[PDB]
Amino acid sequence: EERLESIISGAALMADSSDRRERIVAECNAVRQALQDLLSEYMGNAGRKERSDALNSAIDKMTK
């Protein structure tokens, strides 16, 4: 009777109390970082729009 509700409540239906996700995401950020450098360095600081990039960053600072 009351064990039925528990026989299925055992399917993760309680509090959680208390890293893998943040870890994974962390490492994925690591990869993103290294890869982004590698490409900013190949291209070099030439050609691309870097001023409109600064402003956009300052602009959404008056917001974000």
């Binding site: 528990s6 993760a12 239906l13 994925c28 290294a34 982004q36 590698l38 291209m43 030439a46």
Partner: protein
């Protein structure tokens, strides 16, 4: 609409993807022609370590996880990531032996895309796992409702043993919609969930009102509708 269904995935992969777009339009424009490319062996080493850590972390999760779908789907992503990493290495080498290498332009692009593609897969696979967690709870509450057509006050202790579960779910959906990047999807989750919790009291009350034949169907109906919403949630969770 958006390309990455998650605010986290997108925050990480959108830049890289765009950055790769800059390059293609450049090479295509000849902005880098006759130019000597600085030694990239160090940067590629960076990526090689970074990828190595990620894979190591992935390999751990695939081992210590209880999710069977997860166990079979992550490993490929590691391969993709690692091979990509190899194209970048070669590219580094071809530009060290020839700073003006044009062919080397192809394994750099192919490598970069490989890393991005491989990473997204790993990330997408993990998210799917995360979703199955939410779906797990939900499917529970659905079963827990099925156990309503078999309840005197002697057998609402039932409503008491439900309170916590209903909270875990409400938390998962709430925190989940804050992450989706498809606005439609979010509204659906939020509406459905709202309906579930509004309809909770009505369910407990429909059960007390069980104290003939009419009180029965006013109850059966309520579990139907609550189930429809919860099923709606599960569906939207997978889009």
């Amino acid at each position: 609409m958006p390309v990455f269904h998650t605010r986290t995935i997108e925050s990480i992969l959108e830049p890289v993807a765009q950055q790769i777009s800059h390059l293609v339009i450049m090479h295509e424009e000849g902005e880098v022609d006759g130019k000597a490319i600085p030694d990239l062996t160090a940067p590629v080493a960076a990526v090689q370590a970074a990828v190595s850590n990620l894979v190591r972390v992935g390999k751990e999760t695939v081992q210590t996880t209880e999710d069977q779908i997860l166990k079979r789907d992550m490993p490929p992503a590691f391969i993709k990531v690692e091979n990509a990493c190899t194209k970048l290495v070669q590219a580094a080498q071809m530009l060290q032996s020839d700073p003006y290498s044009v062919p080397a332009r192809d394994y750099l692009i192919d490598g970069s895309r490989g890393i991005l593609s491989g990473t997204s897969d790993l990330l997408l696979t993990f998210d799917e796992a995360e979703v199955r967690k939410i779906i797990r709870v939900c499917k529970g509450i659905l079963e827990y409702l099925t156990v309503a057509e078999v309840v005197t006050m002697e057998d609402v202790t039932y409503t008491k043993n439900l309170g916590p579960g209903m909270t875990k779910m409400a938390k998962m959906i709430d925190e989940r919609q804050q992450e989706l990047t498809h606005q439609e999807h979010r509204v659906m989750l939020v509406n459905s969930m709202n309906t579930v919790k509004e309809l909770l009291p009505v369910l407990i009350s429909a059960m007390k009102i069980f104290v003939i034949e009419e009180a029965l169907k006013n109850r059966n109906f309520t579990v139907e509708k609550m189930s429809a919403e919860i099923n709606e949630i599960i569906r939207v969770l997978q889009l």
